[PDB]
Design a protein around this ligand. Structure first.
Ligand SMILES: [Mg+2]
Ligand SMILES: [Mg+2]
Ligand SMILES: [Mg+2]
Ligand SMILES: [Mg+2]
Ligand SMILES: [Mg+2]
Ligand SMILES: [Mg+2]
Ligand SMILES: [Mg+2]
Ligand SMILES: [Mg+2]
Ligand SMILES: [Mg+2]
Ligand SMILES: [Mg+2]
Ligand SMILES: [Mg+2]
Ligand SMILES: [Mg+2]
Ligand SMILES: [Mg+2]
Ligand SMILES: [Mg+2]
Ligand SMILES: [Mg+2]
Ligand SMILES: [Mg+2]
Ligand SMILES: [Mg+2]
Ligand SMILES: [Mg+2]
Ligand SMILES: [Mg+2]
Ligand SMILES: [Mg+2]
Ligand SMILES: [Mg+2]
Ligand SMILES: [Mg+2]
Ligand SMILES: [Mg+2]
Ligand SMILES: [Mg+2]
Ligand SMILES: [Mg+2]
Ligand SMILES: [Mg+2]
Ligand SMILES: [Mg+2]
Ligand SMILES: [Mg+2]
Ligand SMILES: [Mg+2]
Ligand SMILES: [Mg+2]
Ligand SMILES: [Mg+2]
Ligand SMILES: [Mg+2]
Ligand SMILES: [Mg+2]
Ligand SMILES: [Mg+2]
Ligand SMILES: [Mg+2]
Ligand SMILES: [Mg+2]
Ligand SMILES: [Mg+2]
Ligand SMILES: [Mg+2]
Ligand SMILES: [Mg+2]
Ligand SMILES: [Mg+2]
Ligand SMILES: [Mg+2]
Ligand SMILES: [Mg+2]
Ligand SMILES: [Mg+2]
Ligand SMILES: [Mg+2]
Ligand SMILES: [Mg+2]
Ligand SMILES: [Mg+2]
Ligand SMILES: [Mg+2]
Ligand SMILES: [Mg+2]
Ligand SMILES: [Mg+2]
Lengths: 56, 209, 119, 123, 114
RNA sequence: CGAUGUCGGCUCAUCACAUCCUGGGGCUGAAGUAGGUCCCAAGGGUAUGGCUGUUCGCCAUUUAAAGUGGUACGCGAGCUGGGUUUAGAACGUCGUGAGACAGUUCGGUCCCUAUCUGCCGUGGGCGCUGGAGAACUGAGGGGGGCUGCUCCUAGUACGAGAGGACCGGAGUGGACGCAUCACUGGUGUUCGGGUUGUCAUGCCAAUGGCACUGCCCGGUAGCUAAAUGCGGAAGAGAUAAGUGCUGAAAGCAUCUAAGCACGAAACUUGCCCCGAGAUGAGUUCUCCCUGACCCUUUAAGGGUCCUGAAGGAACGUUGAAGACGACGACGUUGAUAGGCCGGGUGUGUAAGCGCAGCGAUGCGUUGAGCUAACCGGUACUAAUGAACCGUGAGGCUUAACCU
RNA sequence: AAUUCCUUGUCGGGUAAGUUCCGACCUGCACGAAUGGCGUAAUGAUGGCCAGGCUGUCUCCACCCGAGACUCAGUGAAAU
RNA sequence: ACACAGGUGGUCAGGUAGAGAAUACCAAGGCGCUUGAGAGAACUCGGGUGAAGGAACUAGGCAAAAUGGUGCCGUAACUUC
RNA sequence: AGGACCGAACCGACUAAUGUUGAAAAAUUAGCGGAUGACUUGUGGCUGGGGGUGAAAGGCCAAUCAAACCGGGAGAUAGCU
């Protein structure tokens, strides 16, 4: 239930060798907006695949 | 013993004229034609490889497309290997029909079974639960004991505990062939086939009996 | 296991899940667009579209069924008056979902679910 | 589907009204006995005067069960109670002379021809 | 499905009469023993019907020799030679499972008009 | 004694044979069935209840058998606490007495979120020498190896009779393990109805909310056993006890010193699964990449422009897949999910109207209405034009080989 | 027998089985008359036994409804 | 010791159902209890149902299951009546 | 009329489960007993440690009781780790 010998910083690093974060592979650019948006998502303005979908 | 491959349509029943309800399994079998024939010299073992259907038209990679083009056949699903018996050989152009199983009595089928996920010991290994009353606390479906005290102080290999059951390859042998439909490309067995509807199974002549 | 099942629990009981979806549909019909988490909106497109295809035909029985399902006379009236004829020429697919980032409060996938004829 | 401590009725004119199945014969670890199976039973209540008395221990043949027996076509014949016919523990033959109620045809072997003949109705 | 609901229909019997739960039904069943085969009759009230094409069946209960007997006849089974209706009953439900509780003049059913 | 939880019970097993059954054989005071003993053999299996805290034991019923032991008299970081073995009280005894009695009697806190090793699953990185998509060969490992009852051989052999075969087949069976819902049902608080109290929709009707899904009746898909299919080798090799052939030592004799041959659920295969991290890193089929310069530390060296192919990765709909990972099928040149059409299946003649009845209610519309997860379709909605990783001919020596 | 070591003393009842229970036999190691002897209707969250109903307590578990456990985002201990 | 499922004396005491300050739904009135969003693995906690048997489980009917209200009929041994 | 009966507040804790670095240094849920009296409760006061009180458990005397807490002898003593 509890440890008998204190582990190393090496063990901690090897355990944390897998929880590294990752970034987006490649951001997409809207056809007629010229801005970068996450793929299959809409832009911060309201554009998605050309035609705007959220006009304020 | 040149087995073939097919798709499980499901199961139903057959009413015989003498009053017997035989539970049969409907297995869709197409013409498993060929992709490659490995001979005694090039690969050592003597076997054939078969594919059925097309599966698509734009999802076959360049290697698979070239492999099919060398043989001269169309595209198809995953390839299936069958070790061929001595005395028989087949041409690349020639296909394999369901007529081969006309003069057989029983067969054996193989397929991937249904996956139950990470199941407990009561289901995966059929253990016995403890008493749910009389004082028991938080120990009802647990396996309880796995080893001994200080000798050997460890759990032996192959211990029956919680794990992932199903989704593995299972073979059911000695199923009676009650119907072989040539024009409809269909085969019927006595049932109890592994998998689900629309899955992929491999049937072959029975080796057990 | 969950072989060939349907219906997302969403960490709620049946009464809670139905009472929330009722208000969700009642707001979606009256605003033609709402914003909510994608898993919670994927059931809205299954609970609202049958209501629209029921309201496509005007009848006393259908209207009372819609009232029993939504518990809002104004919502039922607006449904039957507007969304019926508007979608009468369309065979399904009366809703569209568009994912818009993640909420800052819980880091949850969120999307706008709207009608196909909002504009 | 009969096991230990199961209360059953008697389907012959032997004098026993209520019996209890106490053992299932036919192999080791056998759990349930179907129609036409031999089970050891003991008497729990009997007619004041008859062929048998209370507290006896003897064998019997299962003739009816609420679970029933499946036909080779999927048909199952289900009754409204569990009943048995007493037999001698050595000769394996019926003790009573009459048979009460309908019976199935599962017990249609050489060992139960007398029961088949004496049964008012065979299903 | 195009194979299931084409094999399960080639051997169906297109002669099953229309019947409803609560209607007294007589069923003719082939009983074979020895070298010949006779046709036994089973008359009773139908209490449940489960129809799925070739997998159709119906449960018939009768009070025979004081003890109730319930059979489950398969609708398309070759043994089930013929089905006949002798009476019709007016019952609200379609599964008659309360009849197992009443005996005598309480498990009986009314008559359905027309 | 700066703390190793002790009786017994439940779950879970492992090993040994001084073997309970099955299997093989010898001697029998072995006529046959059926017995006694010994030898070889651990592959498999090896009961349910009453008594008492059980171990042990008695009894009742079965089985072919209900084996003996080691593993802290296995297993309380898997569980209880019925006994012993705290604190209360009594009984009988002991002692003037406080109090004691493996003597009895009623009751009497069993705590821990897994650090490492141990085991079951499932992933990330890299290797395998250009980069890929597949099929596998199989070094090796793991899973099963139980057996009862009748029929023919037969009332034959044997036996005066009573009784009753070995060898070899067939059928039916029980306990297991695997796989499924074609049937039987269970569940199926996401499907249809019955009904009570209360509140609300301005009111009847019709509804919705709560009261365990309020209480209930059935029931689709899925999962399930109590349901149905399969298997316990057939055989081959070398063998244990043990039968022998040919045989001298030892002119005989002897199964052995040479040789030959039979011989078990024991061993390897034969049945199934995993399986090239098998670093000894393997085979076959199909593919893709065939531009130039510069630099010093002249070498498996580095840098620049172009090139970015096969393929992979990522994202979205999702799944008979699944804890997360991981594994299917699709992304407009499409049925992957949702919706819709029709059908199937469940529940039960929906509301609204008219009639009959003073009324509660029934009738016709109407086997109607609704119908979750089911089945055939249908781009109506959501699956993006892109962009990102992956290279540009793949080291040295030697060997046969064409120049 | 709240009392008996021999003891699971013997007999009869209860179940197929009853070291528990009931009524007797009296061999009272070591009952016994106000540290009271024997009964006693009612009473008891008092001990034991038996019977009828009842059910997943069990043969033998199976499904379902929620909260944890699993993933993501924020905060963030412990015994040792 | 806490923005702690603990404790703290009195006063006012609505409608229907209901014998009742029991209990269900509501009025005046007050709250959603200071982490949520996903998926629906094993196992834990609170529960629902279940084919056949019905205490055979257990040290022990522990737990669970079961009865349960009004009016009437009718109710044994014993007994201090 | 009952140191009466069933049953609410109120008082108490007989069983089971959860909880055991818990919501809580004894609690929660489902059951439970008394509930017109030897009852319960609020306020104020008295009983002061070899003593108090105790329907009697070596029980309570401020989460500590076979001799309460604080300060002194007192760095008591310790052949003991
Ligand atoms: Mg990590
Ligand atoms: Mg528990
Ligand atoms: Mg506890
Ligand atoms: Mg341990
Ligand atoms: Mg689906
Ligand atoms: Mg949550
Ligand atoms: Mg320690
Ligand atoms: Mg120590
Ligand atoms: Mg030996
Ligand atoms: Mg032997
Ligand atoms: Mg010997
Ligand atoms: Mg004491
Ligand atoms: Mg105790
Ligand atoms: Mg306790
Ligand atoms: Mg360690
Ligand atoms: Mg056997
Ligand atoms: Mg089903
Ligand atoms: Mg059913
Ligand atoms: Mg409903
Ligand atoms: Mg109102
Ligand atoms: Mg030898
Ligand atoms: Mg072997
Ligand atoms: Mg229909
Ligand atoms: Mg009507
Ligand atoms: Mg439909
Ligand atoms: Mg006595
Ligand atoms: Mg006294
Ligand atoms: Mg009292
Ligand atoms: Mg987190
Ligand atoms: Mg708070
Ligand atoms: Mg508070
Ligand atoms: Mg009030
Ligand atoms: Mg209240
Ligand atoms: Mg309320
Ligand atoms: Mg239900
Ligand atoms: Mg049950
Ligand atoms: Mg009282
Ligand atoms: Mg009271
Ligand atoms: Mg009060
Ligand atoms: Mg109370
Ligand atoms: Mg309480
Ligand atoms: Mg004192
Ligand atoms: Mg104190
Ligand atoms: Mg103090
Ligand atoms: Mg001092
Ligand atoms: Mg001094
Ligand atoms: Mg000192
Ligand atoms: Mg001193
Ligand atoms: Mg001194």
């Amino acid at each position: 239930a509890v440890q008998q010998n204190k582990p190393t910083r090496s063990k901690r690093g090897m355990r944390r060798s897998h929880d590294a974060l990752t970034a987006v592979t490649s951001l997409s650019v809207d056809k007629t907006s010229g801005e970068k948006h996450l793929r299959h998502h809409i832009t911060a303005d309201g554009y998605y695949r050309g035609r705007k979908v959220i006009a304020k | 013993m040149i087995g073939l491959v097919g798709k499980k349509v499901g199961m139903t029943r057959i009413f015989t004229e003498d009053g017997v309800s035989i539970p049969v399994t409907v297995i869709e079998v197409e013409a498993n034609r060929v992709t490659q024939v490995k001979d005694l010299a090039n690969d050592g073992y003597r076997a054939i490889q078969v594919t059925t259907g097309a599966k698509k038209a734009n999802r076959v990679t360049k290697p698979e497309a070239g492999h099919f083009a060398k043989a001269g056949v169309e595209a198809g699903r995953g390839l299936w290997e069958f070790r061929l018996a001595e005395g028989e050989e087949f041409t690349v152009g020639q296909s394999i029909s369901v007529e081969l199983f006309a003069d057989v009595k029983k067969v054996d089928v193989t397929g991937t079974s249904k996956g139950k996920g990470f199941a407990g010991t009561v289901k995966r290994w059929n253990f016995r639960t403890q008493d749910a009353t009389h004082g028991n606390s938080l120990s009802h479906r647990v396996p309880g004991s796995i080893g001994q005290n200080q000798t050997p102080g460890k759990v032996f290999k192959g211990k029956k505990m919680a794990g992932q059951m199903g989704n593995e390859r299972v073979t059911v042998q000695s199923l009676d062939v009650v119907r072989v439909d040539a024009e409809r490309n269909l085969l019927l067995v006595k049932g109890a086939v592994p998998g689900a509807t629309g899955s992929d199974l491999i049937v072959k002549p029975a080796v057990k009996a | 296991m969950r072989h060939r099942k349907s219906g997302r629990q969403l960490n709620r009981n049946s009464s809670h899940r139905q009472a929330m979806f009722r208000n969700m549909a009642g707001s979606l019909v009256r605003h033609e667009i709402i914003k909510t988490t994608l898993p919670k909106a994927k059931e809205l497109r299954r609970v609202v579209e049958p209501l629209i295809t029921l309201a496509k035909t005007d009848s006393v029985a259908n209207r009372r069924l819609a009232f029993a399902r939504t518990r809002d006379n104004e919502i039922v009236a607006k449904l039957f008056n507007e969304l019926g004829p508007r979608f009468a020429s369309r065979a399904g697919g009366y809703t569209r979902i568009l994912k818009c980032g993640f909420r800052a409060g819980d880091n949850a996938p969120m999307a706008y679910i709207e009608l196909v004829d909002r504009s | 589907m009969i096991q230990e401590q199961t209360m059953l009725n008697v389907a012959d004119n032997s004098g026993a009204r209520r019996v209890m199945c106490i053992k299932v014969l036919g192999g080791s670890h056998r759990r349930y006995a179907g129609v036409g199976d031999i089970i050891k039973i003991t008497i729990k209540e009997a007619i004041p005067r008859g062929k048998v008395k209370k507290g006896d221990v003897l064998k019997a043949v299962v003739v009816r069960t609420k679970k029933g027996v499946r036909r080779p076509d999927g048909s199952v014949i289900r009754f409204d109670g569990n009943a048995c016919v007493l037999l001698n523990n050595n000769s394996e033959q019926p003790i009573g002379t009459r048979i009460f109620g309908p019976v199935t045809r599962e017990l249609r072997s050489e060992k139960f021809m007398k029961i088949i003949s004496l049964a008012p109705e065979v299903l | 499905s195009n194979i299931i609901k084409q094999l399960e229909q080639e051997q169906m019997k297109q002669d099953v009469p229309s019947f409803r739960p609560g209607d007294t039904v007589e069923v003719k069943v082939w009983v074979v023993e020895g070298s010949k085969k006779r046709l036994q009759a089973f008359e009773g009230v139908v209490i449940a019907i489960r129809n799925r094409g070739l997998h159709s069946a119906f449960t018939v209960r009768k009070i025979s020799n004081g003890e109730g007997v319930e059979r489950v006849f398969q609708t398309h089974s070759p043994v089930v030679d013929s089905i006949s209706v002798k009476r019709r009953g007016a019952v609200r439900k379609a599964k008659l499972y309360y009849l197992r509780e009443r005996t005598g003049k309480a498990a009986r059913i009314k008559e359905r008009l027309n």
